[PDB]
Design an enzyme around this catalytic site. Structure first.
Site, PDB file in Angstrom:
ATOM      1  N   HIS A 183       4.825  -0.195  10.422  1.00  0.00           N
ATOM      2  CA  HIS A 183       4.047   0.869   9.531  1.00  0.00           C
ATOM      3  C   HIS A 183       2.807   1.427   9.973  1.00  0.00           C
ATOM      4  CE1 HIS A 183       6.057  -1.061   5.709  1.00  0.00           C
ATOM      5  NE2 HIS A 183       6.075  -2.065   6.717  1.00  0.00           N
ATOM      6  N   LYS A 232      -6.108   7.107  -3.053  1.00  0.00           N
ATOM      7  CA  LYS A 232      -5.324   6.179  -1.969  1.00  0.00           C
ATOM      8  C   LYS A 232      -6.647   5.423  -1.293  1.00  0.00           C
ATOM      9  CE  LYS A 232      -4.278   9.974   0.018  1.00  0.00           C
ATOM     10  NZ  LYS A 232      -2.898  10.138   0.456  1.00  0.00           N
ATOM     11  N   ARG A 233      -6.265   4.450  -0.402  1.00  0.00           N
ATOM     12  CA  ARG A 233      -7.544   3.640  -0.004  1.00  0.00           C
ATOM     13  C   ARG A 233      -8.534   4.550   0.907  1.00  0.00           C
ATOM     14  NH1 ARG A 233      -7.135  -2.313  -0.102  1.00  0.00           N
ATOM     15  NH2 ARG A 233      -9.105  -2.250   1.023  1.00  0.00           N
ATOM     16  N   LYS A 267      -7.854   8.933   6.639  1.00  0.00           N
ATOM     17  CA  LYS A 267      -7.212   9.766   5.521  1.00  0.00           C
ATOM     18  C   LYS A 267      -8.012  11.084   5.151  1.00  0.00           C
ATOM     19  CE  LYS A 267      -5.178   5.441   3.626  1.00  0.00           C
ATOM     20  NZ  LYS A 267      -3.592   5.837   3.328  1.00  0.00           N
ATOM     21  N   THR A 298       3.269   7.334   0.565  1.00  0.00           N
ATOM     22  CA  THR A 298       4.263   7.265  -0.568  1.00  0.00           C
ATOM     23  C   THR A 298       3.632   7.837  -2.030  1.00  0.00           C
ATOM     24  OG1 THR A 298       3.366   5.289  -0.993  1.00  0.00           O
ATOM     25  CG2 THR A 298       5.598   5.194   0.462  1.00  0.00           C
ATOM     26  N   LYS A 323       5.016  10.396  -5.204  1.00  0.00           N
ATOM     27  CA  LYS A 323       4.669  10.029  -6.251  1.00  0.00           C
ATOM     28  C   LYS A 323       4.441  11.430  -7.264  1.00  0.00           C
ATOM     29  CE  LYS A 323       3.098   5.457  -5.272  1.00  0.00           C
ATOM     30  NZ  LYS A 323       1.767   4.812  -5.088  1.00  0.00           N
TER      31      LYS A 323
HETATM   32  O1  LIG Z   1      -1.978  -2.273   6.702  1.00  0.00           O
HETATM   33  C1  LIG Z   1      -1.280  -1.388   6.454  1.00  0.00           C
HETATM   34  N1  LIG Z   1      -1.380  -0.848   5.012  1.00  0.00           N
HETATM   35  C2  LIG Z   1      -0.569  -0.042   4.542  1.00  0.00           C
HETATM   36  O2  LIG Z   1      -0.991   0.599   3.112  1.00  0.00           O
HETATM   37  N2  LIG Z   1       0.237   0.673   5.331  1.00  0.00           N
HETATM   38  C3  LIG Z   1       1.249   1.915   4.891  1.00  0.00           C
HETATM   39  O3  LIG Z   1       2.652   1.668   4.894  1.00  0.00           O
HETATM   40  C4  LIG Z   1       3.055   2.385   3.646  1.00  0.00           C
HETATM   41  C5  LIG Z   1       4.524   1.858   3.490  1.00  0.00           C
HETATM   42  O4  LIG Z   1       5.234   2.091   4.785  1.00  0.00           O
HETATM   43  C6  LIG Z   1       3.126   3.845   4.352  1.00  0.00           C
HETATM   44  O5  LIG Z   1       3.748   4.793   3.688  1.00  0.00           O
HETATM   45  C7  LIG Z   1       1.610   4.196   4.968  1.00  0.00           C
HETATM   46  O6  LIG Z   1       1.896   5.284   5.685  1.00  0.00           O
HETATM   47  C8  LIG Z   1       0.965   3.114   5.799  1.00  0.00           C
HETATM   48  O7  LIG Z   1      -0.468   3.335   5.888  1.00  0.00           O
HETATM   49  C9  LIG Z   1       0.386   0.376   6.517  1.00  0.00           C
HETATM   50  C10 LIG Z   1      -0.385  -0.838   7.233  1.00  0.00           C
HETATM   51 BR1  LIG Z   1      -0.085  -1.199   8.778  1.00  0.00          BR
END
Ligand SMILES: O=c1[nH]c(=O)n([C@@H]2O[C@H](CO)[C@@H](O)[C@H](O)[C@H]2O)cc1Br
Ligand SMILES: O=c1[nH]c(=O)n([C@@H]2O[C@H](CO)[C@@H](O)[C@H](O)[C@H]2O)cc1Br
EC number: 2.4.1.1
Lengths: 807, 807
Positions: free
Chosen positions: B348, B539-540, B545, B647, B651
């Protein structure tokens, strides 16, 4: 099946079964192929709880409608045991549920065995609370028990090599289907801080907050449709690096984590004091809130009664002041009149080591305002004393709520006597002792405060629930009215010479024994003989309860068998059980002795099955319901003057066991009721104990004049009972010879003689049983319904009521 | 009311109401006079849960009957949000319950607001898990999510003086009516110990035992009567002075206490590793047990699929070996074939700081056997590498599972690639980057492993549940088939020129905005203007970001207003929200900036209501369901190459917001689907970022050539945004000028130009909305049902099925 258990109406049996299935399916989320007997137990517990609830909501309504005076029983201990069968009995579902579960192809008694005991108590004091609740409900009083929801109750006891091992009682593991969590009435409780004086008076500030969250458990009366509440508080940390800050929430929740397991022994630990304040603080706010839905606190005592169960909730007194003075702004003298008029105190001991004397430095740090209140209380109390006994400076020092010495203590008992309108002992001899000795000064000051309420037990759990065979045969003769009028058992007196009743009484006892011996093999592979006399002593292990004296009789019977192997003796199964507090070194040694005697006596081929010594593991409420019905001889052999009342003794009287005992606590009243002829009394009276103490107890003397006893000690010193550790019991022998505060040797001789008379009577079955009949028939006074009616009239000022609420 | 919400049959509405009352009365033990809206919420939650259960027991049966291949989704995160409305929607109860609760005089939407979010996740990764479960159920896969039941979820965020404050999310406070505790399947998990070699191989001994107790929560498919399980483990200490020994039980239960709140950042704390092993250990035993009710492990991979959600559950790989080799006695090479064939891995991120590299000394102490397994794995892996690239010692060092340096680490990613049969990225550009850069060596070794699965979201929560007005108008035109076939939204393309549909789309957006502005005043007294463009970035908070870039645009719009106050500008409400990890100093400063800009911009009387800057407190699933439907502009402005997929972006596409974004992650595929014409793309591509990096990023350059930007920085340095602490933001200015790993200035200029075009289009309502229509109509690809079908076919080897199970 049996008559006393109620109707199995085709109607009810049909509605119960579909609710069983509904719960199995929706509540338990299981189907009939995967369900274990545990799931069946739960489906049934929710089915039976369903019937309580409508009644529960209606009782709490009624009290709103009618606004009676409310009774608050504060205890740190509620030793409740199992709830299922109790609820079926008080509600009349027992025969129906028995039908219902049979038609579903289940055995109900097998299911009942799956319920964990709620062991939120140590022994007599916590169980008295439990019986008292059942009686308050049965007698229609508007009564709440308040305490703590301990996540771990009294430890489960394991025996490993004849030593006690403690493991955690994790009673909540599978859920408690009886409680209802009530997070919406969570309250804040305060600790530490410091006191600020303003123009407007004292303010308690910079405090640490613990939240107190309540859990309600239903307490149903006997067939009167009253269902009262037991409210228990649980500790919750409030919501205000980060990881650690979260984990430390645990520090605040440790308050309700675990029950301190010391019975009749004060340990002055902080965690304990926090538990004491916690329940007192959360409860008084709940009480005052309820009162506020009736400025005017003059009516507080006409509306509120607070019963202090020993000194455990003694802070209720300065806290009630704190609230009234500091927050409600009443003036001191008025606040003090409301308090004294509201609270009352029950004392449960005269043992010095059992009294709470809290160090000043603990109360200063933790409760700084309450210490200030306690000094104000003490000062004004001493001025009443000074004024009544001018120049008696000695009295002033003795009566003080503050004890001088290398560390100052607050004597919690002195505070309860001062801030309560009634103070009571728990048996007639006990209350006299109070007035003559430890509270003598307070009696001379305020004689009108001192009373007596001889303890009782509930006939529902202690006869109807655990001895249905006896309740049954009693009910064929005299009806059922007696279950809530135990005084009616006298009518059985005219059956003492009835050949059919004699044989029924004896038959029931024999069945009970056969069941118990079978429970013994099934659950612990131990092989008793059901034709022996069942000599049982069950209760917590303590030097004052004199299990050791019981041990010395046992060793005696066995030495006499070895000396004349071919002579006939009445066979006995001696059964001793009880838990020892984990730090109580001597009590733990005593358990070890008992099993050690077992390893020798139980495997001598000469002894045969003439004598067996069993140690019963994990003594608890639910084990009591099993062994008490099955006993022939009840051992109640504490040194005269030390057992405040006892209630174990009453359980046995009521279940056709005969008592061997000293003139102690309620024993004096039991023998008074049945007649001394029908009781096996032996040993010193309280007066003889005092004669001994002036002269000086010297145990060597008994050792020199009694060869039987000399021999026992020599066997104890030389390793006869511990071949691989010859010195194992030197602590016991040493304590017996030089440091025995309870005079075991002084009663040895008289106890052994008395024991021979028990055997004699046992050899004439017919005469044993008529004596039984005579005890059972006089046990009426020992009902907790009698005790509660006295509390109600003579202390709380409310009228009992046997009247049904509408269904 | 609305068509998509199902039937309100007279029949159902009547049965629902009596169950409401039955639960209020029996389950809740309340009556209609004391019930609070919270009690009403619960009575309804139990009423609706009743309908799940029969379906739940039947699904789990079916799987026993038919014995399909099982899918195990291991994640440390399941960000579920609320469950009530979701369950009503997937079951078709929504209109009935709405009728039922209205006839009882309650407003259902008011009740829905009382349910706590289950915040057992941080952001995108935990929420992907959540969407994936909904899609597995909807597509009839035999699929279980396994994770941990954290007692505290992501902290609740409070703003105090524009700074974040964290408080504990105490989500369990009032009970979770959705879970069913399953104490009868508690399992032991092992820690510490040491390894013993015998004749018969290795044995792991002297371990500390934590018990793992499961909780099951139902996961219903969309109208197909499938209800799957989410099993979460909780930590329990086993049952074996005393007081302290009991309190220390807490040490073992801290394992499931709290969710580590760092997103896209590895912290190598021990507690975290214990959580990682805990879920992996308890889950694999549950899996193997289920398999054992089908000696022969060859069929294991035909029966089991394990999906690793990032490297969080990477120990599943050596643990699977441990069990197979040490306990089941398979030989190594066979155990290894079963493992690789069983597990698969989803990556991810490519951020260095986000990758798990666990210190060897932690794994040695805590998991000594698993480290031995990992060395064996690594050795045999390196021999495959050596054998394929003879003499390339560099490759050997890079590819190793063991990283050398002052502390050795295990690179968890290298382990997952080695012990899995498939490895996937989460968007097309992301998976290319993987193959070209960080996993290049592994790709050259085993190209057949590497795949792509572009992420999706569930249309049920993300359209039907949170935008019923839009789902409705879409369904009047094309039917309802689209809710589980999102590809059907293309049919909307032929409505782009329909004057009625245009106005309906715009009308729905306007209503959503009016609702959101009203939620804003009611719950946070903040006074927006519903006629402005709603520019939102939620978002976080993370440097990558680029919230900062958003900030600089905002300050720009405001400086331009002050320079020409009387010129017309499109009004905007800029809304930024998200939580920052508690130790992430920079992210916490960024929140402070945003509110600081708010204090200035929101109270300039010249600005009017032309510009408002809001910081949205406590961004979470349930707040997302509210703000996403109401947005016009979706901000997705991460530096090309850093956001794996996103994601949030999907949305918004689905809910009629237009996107301004960089060519990053799934943005590339979204614009591909709608056409670049209908997307607002700006800034560097991945290639430009690399051109910049070779040459060297020097931010001074942009500062010197852009007067608008120079001015913003000067305002930041001199205290224009913090009058009482002129030096407050020197860390931000300093990071921007000298230490910016994410090139904010390099995209500044292009971003501001692009933003002017958004305003331009906004001025022609008709043309904005037709562009909207064009996005909504092409969002089909981004359904999680599409992603899961690809996982199913290309990785797990099972056939999706849309077929209903019998009711
Ligand atoms: O620690 C994490 N937290 C998180 O939200 N993602 C997210 O994973 C989501 C699900 O794959 C992606 O859409 C985002 O691009 C990605 O930042 C990955 C890690 Br590694
Ligand atoms: O700590 C205690 N534990 C206890 O069981 N009791 C018992 O209280 C029972 C209830 O009053 C009495 O019958 C017993 O005589 C008495 O020992 C008293 C104290 Br104090």
């Amino acid at each position: 099946q049996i008559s006393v258990r109620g109707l199995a109406g085709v109607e009810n049996v049909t509605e119960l079964k579909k609710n069983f299935n509904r719960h199995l399916h929706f509540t338990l989320v299981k189907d009939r192929n995967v369900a274990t007997p545990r799931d069946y137990y739960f489906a049934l517990a929710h089915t039976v709880r369903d019937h309580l609830v409508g009644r529960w909501i209606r009782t709490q309504q009624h009290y709103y409608e009618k606004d009676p005076k409310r009774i608050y029983y504060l205890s740190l201990e509620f030793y409740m045991g199992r709830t299922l069968q109790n609820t079926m009995v008080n509600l009349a579902l027992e025969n129906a549920c028995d039908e219902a579960t049979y038609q579903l192809g289940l055995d109900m008694e097998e299911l009942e065995e799956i319920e964990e005991d709620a062991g939120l108590g140590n022994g007599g004091l916590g169980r008295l609370a439990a019986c008292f609740l059942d009686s308050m409900a049965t007698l229609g009083l508007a009564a709440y028990g308040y305490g703590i929801r301990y996540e771990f109750g009294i430890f489960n006891q394991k025996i490993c090599g004849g030593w006690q091992m403690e493991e955690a009682d994790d009673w909540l593991r599978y859920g408690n289907p009886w409680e209802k969590a009530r997070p919406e009435f969570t309250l804040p409780v305060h600790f530490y801080g410091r006191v600020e004086h303003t123009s407007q008076g004292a303010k308690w500030v910079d405090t640490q907050v613990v939240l107190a969250m309540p859990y309600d458990t239903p307490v149903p009366g006997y067939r009167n449709n009253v269902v009262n509440t037991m409210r228990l508080w649980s500790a919750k940390a409030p919501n205000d690096g980060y990881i650690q800050a979260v984990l430390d929430r645990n520090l605040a929740e440790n308050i309700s984590r675990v029950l301190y397991p010391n019975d009749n022994f004060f340990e002055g630990k902080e965690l304990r004091l926090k538990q004491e304040y916690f329940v007192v603080a959360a409860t008084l706010q709940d009480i005052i809130r309820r009162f506020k839905s009736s400025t005017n606190f003059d009516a507080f005592p006409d509306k509120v009664a607070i019963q202090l169960n020993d000194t455990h909730p003694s802070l209720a007194i300065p806290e009630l002041m704190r609230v009234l003075v500091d927050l409600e702004r009443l003036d001191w003298d008025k606040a003090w009149e409301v308090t004294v008029k509201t609270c009352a105190y029950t004392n449960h001991t005269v043992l010095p080591e059992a009294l709470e004397r809290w160090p000043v430095h603990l109360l200063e740090t933790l409760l700084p305002r309450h210490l200030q209140i306690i000094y104000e209380i003490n000062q004004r109390f001493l001025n009443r004393v000074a004024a009544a006994f001018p120049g008696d400076v000695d009295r002033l020092r003795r009566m003080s709520l503050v004890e001088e010495g290398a560390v100052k203590r607050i004597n919690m008992a002195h505070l309860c006597i001062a801030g309560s309108h009634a103070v009571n002992g728990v048996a007639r001899i006990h209350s006299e002792i109070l007035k003559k000795t430890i509270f003598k000064d307070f009696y001379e000051l305020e004689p009108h405060k001192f009373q007596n309420k001889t303890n009782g037990i509930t006939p529902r759990r202690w006869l109807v629930l655990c001895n249905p065979g006896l309740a049954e045969i009693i009910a064929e003769r005299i009806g059922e009215e007696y279950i809530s009028d135990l005084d009616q058992l006298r009518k059985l007196l005219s059956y003492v010479d009835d050949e059919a009743f004699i044989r029924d009484v004896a038959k029931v006892k024999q069945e009970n024994k056969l069941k118990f011996a079978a429970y013994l093999e099934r659950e612990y592979k131990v092989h008793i003989n059901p034709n022996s006399l069942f000599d049982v002593q069950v209760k917590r292990i303590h030097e004052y309860k004199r299990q050791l004296l019981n041990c010395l009789h046992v060793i005696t019977l066995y030495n006499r068998i070895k000396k004349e192997p071919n002579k006939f003796v009445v066979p006995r199964t001696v059964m001793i059980g009880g838990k020892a507090a984990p730090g109580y070194h001597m009590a733990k040694m005593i358990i070890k002795l008992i099993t050690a005697i077992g390893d020798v006596v139980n495997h001598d081929p000469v002894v045969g099955d003439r004598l067996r010594v069993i140690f019963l593991e994990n003594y608890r409420v639910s084990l009591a319901e099993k062994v008490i019905p099955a006993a022939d001889l009840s051992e109640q052999i504490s040194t005269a003057g030390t057992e405040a009342s006892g209630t174990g003794n009453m359980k046995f009287m009521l279940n056709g066991a005969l008592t061997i005992g000293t003139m102690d606590g309620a024993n004096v009243e039991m023998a008074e009721e049945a007649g001394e002829e029908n009781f096996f009394i032996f040993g010193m009276r309280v007066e003889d104990v005092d004669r001994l103490d002036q002269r000086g107890y010297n145990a060597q003397e008994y050792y020199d004049r009694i060869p039987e006893l000399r021999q026992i000690i020599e066997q104890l010193s030389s390793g006869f009972f511990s071949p691989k550790q010859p010195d194992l019991f030197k602590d016991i022998v040493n304590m017996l010879m030089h440091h025995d505060r309870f005079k075991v040797f002084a009663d040895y001789e008289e106890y052994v003689k008395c024991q021979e008379r028990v055997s004699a009577l046992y050899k004439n079955p017919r005469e044993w049983t008529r004596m039984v009949i005579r005890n059972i028939a006089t046990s009426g006074k020992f009902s907790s319904d009698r005790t509660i009616a006295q509390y109600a009239r003579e202390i709380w000022g409310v009228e009992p009521s046997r009247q049904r609420l509408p269904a």
